Amino acid sequence: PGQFGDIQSRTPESEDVYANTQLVLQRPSAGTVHVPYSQAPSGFKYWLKERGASLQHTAPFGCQIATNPVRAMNCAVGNMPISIDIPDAAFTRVVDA
């Protein structure tokens, strides 16, 4: 309750919902018909305010982060081998050069 994951669902369309909000019903004030309760505020809303910096700003090696799809871009890490196959037609003999 009050934390990220207080309400969970396997998929956006799913009706199957897990929740732990500590919802407690309280006695109504005298002369009224309202229904008071004590419940932990959405952990999603709290998380949104307490998110902090995203990987786009905190990642090592200057990595750029994007979503849809999730991508790590331009990370300055290690090295990358390249194999090039060049046809004989592309070569000029030293006698012609």
Partner: peptide, 13 residues
Amino acid sequence: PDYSCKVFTGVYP
């Protein structure tokens, strides 16, 4: 998902 029910007696709304 997270259900509660309670009956309050002595109510005079």
